[PDB]
Amino acid sequence: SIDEIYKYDKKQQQEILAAKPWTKDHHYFKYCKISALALLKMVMHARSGGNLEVMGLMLGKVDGETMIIMDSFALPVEGTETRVNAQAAAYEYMAAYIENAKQVGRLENAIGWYASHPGYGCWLSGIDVSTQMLNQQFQEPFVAVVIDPTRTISAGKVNLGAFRTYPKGYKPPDEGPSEYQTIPLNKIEDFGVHCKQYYALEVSYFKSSLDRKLLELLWNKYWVNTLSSSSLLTNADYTTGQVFDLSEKLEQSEAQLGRGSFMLGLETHDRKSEDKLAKATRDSCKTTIEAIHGLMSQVIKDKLFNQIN
Amino acid sequence: SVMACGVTGSVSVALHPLVILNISDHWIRMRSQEGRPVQVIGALIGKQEGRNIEVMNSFELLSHTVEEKIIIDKEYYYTKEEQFKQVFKELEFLGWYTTGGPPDPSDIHVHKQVCEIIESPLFLKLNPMTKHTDLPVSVFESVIDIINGEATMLFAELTYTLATEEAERIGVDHVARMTATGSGENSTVAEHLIAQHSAIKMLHSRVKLILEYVKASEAGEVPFNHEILREAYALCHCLPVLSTDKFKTDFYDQCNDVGLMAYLGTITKTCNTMNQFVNKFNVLYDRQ
Amino acid sequence: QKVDDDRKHEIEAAIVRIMKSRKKMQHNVLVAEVTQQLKARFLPSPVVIKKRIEGLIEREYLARTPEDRKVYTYVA
Amino acid sequence: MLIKVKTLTGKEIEIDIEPTDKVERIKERVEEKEGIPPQQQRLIYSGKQMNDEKTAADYKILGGSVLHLVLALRGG
Ligand SMILES: [Zn+2]
């Protein structure tokens, strides 16, 4: 059932919020499901911000290890945040909008915050980490989503990440692919200082009626120029960096395996090594299938156009 | 009849995907909350420059059914009007939207309550239970006609267009890509080929229209449409785009590169399967 | 009192403007980059933008370590 | 009476409140415990957002009333 996810069960949410399973595991939340509406709104806000960072709130819910997102809304930022934080008259519009949604139907409460990084990638800065750590202390089920309007245009695919922080003092396990990202020199220092204080969630969608309609319409409308070359992957950057990350991860796994071959009776090492190899394989397979799809479209369209008759 | 006959559009209406997206979400949740597809009512905001109207955003409105008529909480609408002022001042109210088929004798009641608020409101109706391949969205304006000696408000369909910024085009395009390829590589080329299939259908429809026009001109119509016919001849001259040695060499080069990448990906998948098999094989019989 | 009030408002505008840009700097790269991001230049008066970020060393949020300027606590 | 506003500190901070006092004075009391200006502070109680010029007695707030207001942060 495509529309099953849109059903809101208030008592079930209250039961989950009373249970607090995330207190039993700091890696509890692993997946982030984002609605088409949410994605579109967030991307539009980020690109209207242009080269300036904007932010908003995300409405949604939790389901097992998965955090869901549905909505998002701007807060009065008089004089581009002339006061502390991008809030000013924040919950003024927020609480009104919230009571108004309890009135017109929307009952999904705050599930997180989104912020934009125009032209400098998706990750959490020191300020972002402090903000998310605070959000993980009051509204425990919160997620820091970062978007990139400039990379959305450059690479073609929307650059989006979902993140959760670790509590002060707590160390992550050895397991950690950590995809490589191009970070400008004015941001790389802060990135490196805080990159191990949080982790990235797996961001996934679920199709839907919102998708079906939106996608079909805009697609036909603007894709009459269906060519757009055919390979926006031609830019080395993305592909090259992904392949480099894969190589690094696999070489690290090999170094581990070589040292673990001496220790007889370490099952955990074998477990993490197998998992890392498997993650590397799936990442490579997704890249390969994307390239294959691009080639398929290119070949079909080019053959149709050039020598049809 | 609430539809005006012989009345042409006086203003140009520009619609954005966000407006359609808001209507779809509003209809879905109300259907989920109250079973049957309950009709939804909202408001339209955006920028208007003279006779050019651009609907950029849209929010939902409160509706109270009393005495079998829909009463819109304009005070809630007015409460929300200053709410959207705090975030966006460039956007001005343009009209209201609803869901359903043909106009009913309840939308005229709703539209007149929107006509008293602002000078010229716009009426938009979406059909979520459509079956054709066309867009089930129509924009209607308010017109006053003398029917049987009494001034009756009617709806005149407007030939609206679709306005979209580079950012919205790219973001929704990524939305299309996220449906084409499933999260766990589900329905990989299902929506992919269907996308090119629909593009080819559009091109074939254009071709069949041109061919039908030519066949009709062969028998009747204008014997020589001048510009049109000459340009169509020159355009088929481009059907065999035709190439040289260098273009074919580059095409084969790209094909070979992508084929090598595909071979590498298949090798990676095969070696992962081999690793899993060896891990199990070290378990079932082998020790250490 | 005129020059005292004159300096009072321009230092107040100086601090307000810089915390909006709010980026880490080595010693001299952003202190000049913030001036070109204002409305009507020359109002900044660099003589105050250096001694009030040096007056910010008593606390966090760009604690601005005294000698080798590089620890600009970019966390708040 | 003392009311336990759930000011963002991980606990419900108890403050001194009189029934006749306007609810906007409650915002300043929370700022004395935290540091959020009343403009960004948004008092919320029993699921409904509290007013500004309305008095506390009009909301029937007692000494056992647990509040949950949404304040702000110290970004920049
Ligand atoms: Zn950030």
Curated annotation (Swiss-Prot), chain A:
Pfam families: CSN5_C (PF18323), JAB (PF01398). The gene is COPS5. This is COP9 signalosome complex subunit 5. It is found in: Cytoplasm, Cytosol; Nucleus; Cytoplasm, Perinuclear region; Cytoplasmic vesicle, Secretory vesicle, Synaptic vesicle. Zn(2+) binds at A115, H117, D128. A motif (JAMM motif) lies at residues 115-128. GO terms for cellular component: chromatin; COP9 signalosome; cytoplasm; cytosol; eukaryotic translation initiation factor 3 complex; nucleoplasm; nucleus; perinuclear region of cytoplasm. It comes from Homo sapiens (Human). Probable protease subunit of the COP9 signalosome complex (CSN), a complex involved in various cellular and developmental processes. The CSN complex is an essential regulator of the ubiquitin (Ubl) conjugation pathway by mediating the deneddylation of the cullin subunits of the SCF-type E3 ligase complexes, leading to decrease the Ubl ligase activity of SCF-type complexes such as SCF, CSA or DDB2. The complex is also involved in phosphorylation of p53/TP53, c-jun/JUN, IkappaBalpha/NFKBIA, ITPK1 and IRF8, possibly via its association with CK2 and PKD kinases. Its main location: cytoplasm.
From Swiss-Prot, chain B:
This is COP9 signalosome complex subunit 6. Its main location: nucleus. Component of the CSN complex, composed of COPS1/GPS1, COPS2, COPS3, COPS4, COPS5, COPS6, COPS7 (COPS7A or COPS7B), COPS8 and COPS9 isoform 1. In the complex, it probably interacts directly with COPS2, COPS4, COPS5, COPS7 (COPS7A or COPS7B) and COPS9 isoform 1. Interacts with the translation initiation factor EIF3S6. Interacts weakly with RBX1. Directly interacts with COP1 and 14-3-3 protein sigma/SFN. Interacts with ERCC6. (Microbial infection) Interacts with the HIV-1 protein Vpr. Residues 13-146 form the MPN domain. GO terms for biological process: protein deneddylation; protein neddylation; regulation of protein neddylation. It is found in: Nucleus; Cytoplasm; Cytoplasm, Perinuclear region. InterPro entries: EIF3F/CSN6-like_C, JAMM/MPN+_dom, MPN, MPN_CSN6. The keyword Nucleus applies. Residues 183-288 are annotated as: Interaction with Vpr. It comes from the Eukaryota. PANTHER family: COP9 SIGNALOSOME COMPLEX SUBUNIT 6, EUKARYOTIC TRANSLATION INITIATION FACTOR 3 SUBUNIT F-RELATED. The gene is COPS6. Keywords: Cytoplasm, Host-virus interaction, Nucleus, Signalosome. GO terms for cellular component: COP9 signalosome; cytoplasm; cytosol; nucleoplasm; nucleus; perinuclear region of cytoplasm. Belongs to the peptidase M67A family. CSN6 subfamily. Widely expressed. Coiled coil: none annotated. The keyword Nucleus applies. Transmembrane segments: none annotated. The lineage of its organism: Eukaryota, Metazoa, Chordata, Craniata, Vertebrata. PROSITE patterns: MPN. It comes from Homo sapiens.
From Swiss-Prot, chain C:
Residues 6-68 form the Cullin neddylation domain. Brain, spermatozoa, and testis (at protein level). Widely expressed. Coiled coil: none annotated. There is a cross-link at K20 (Glycyl lysine isopeptide (Lys-Gly) (interchain with G-Cter in NEDD8)). It is found in: Nucleus; Golgi apparatus; Cell projection, Cilium, Flagellum; Cytoplasm, Cytoskeleton, Spindle. Transmembrane segments: none annotated. Changing H27R: Found in a patient with autism spectrum disorder; uncertain significance. Neddylated. Attachment of NEDD8 is required for the E3 ubiquitin-protein ligase activity of the BCR complex. Deneddylated via its interaction with the COP9 signalosome (CSN) complex. It is linked to Pseudohypoaldosteronism 2E: An autosomal dominant disorder characterized by severe hypertension, hyperkalemia, hyperchloremia, hyperchloremic metabolic acidosis, and correction of physiologic abnormalities by thiazide diuretics. High-glucose conditions in renal tubular epithelial cells lead to up-regulation of CUL3 expression, significant increase in CUL3-mediated ubiquitination of MRPL12 and dysregulation of mitochondrial biosynthesis. Belongs to the cullin family. This is Cullin-3. The chain holds residues 693 to 768 of 768 of the full protein.
Swiss-Prot record, chain D:
Changing A72R: Prevents adenylation by UBE1C. Cleavage of precursor form by UCHL3 or SENP8 is necessary for function. (Microbial infection) Deamidated at Gln-40 by bacterial cyclomodulin Cif produced by enteropathogenic E.coli, Y.pseudotuberculosis or B.pseudomallei, leading to impair NEDD8 ability to activate cullin-RING-based E3 ubiquitin-protein ligase complexes (CRL complexes). Deamidation occurs on NEDD8-modified cullins. NEDD8 deamidation prevents switching from the inactive to active state by maintaining the 'closed' structure of the CRL complexes. Deamidation may also impair its deconjugation by the COP9 signalosome; However this result needs additional evidences. InterPro entries: Nedd8-like, Ubiquitin-like_dom, Ubiquitin-like_domsf, Ubiquitin_CS, Ubiquitin_dom, Ubiquitin_ubiquitin-like. Highly expressed in heart, skeletal muscle, spleen, thymus, prostate, testis, ovary, colon and leukocytes. It comes from the Eukaryota. GO terms for molecular function: protein tag activity; ubiquitin protein ligase binding. GO terms for biological process: anatomical structure morphogenesis; modification-dependent protein catabolic process; protein localization; protein modification process; protein neddylation; proteolysis; regulation of postsynapse assembly; regulation of proteolysis. CDD domains: Ubl_NEDD8. The keyword Acetylation applies. Belongs to the ubiquitin family. This is Ubiquitin-like protein NEDD8.
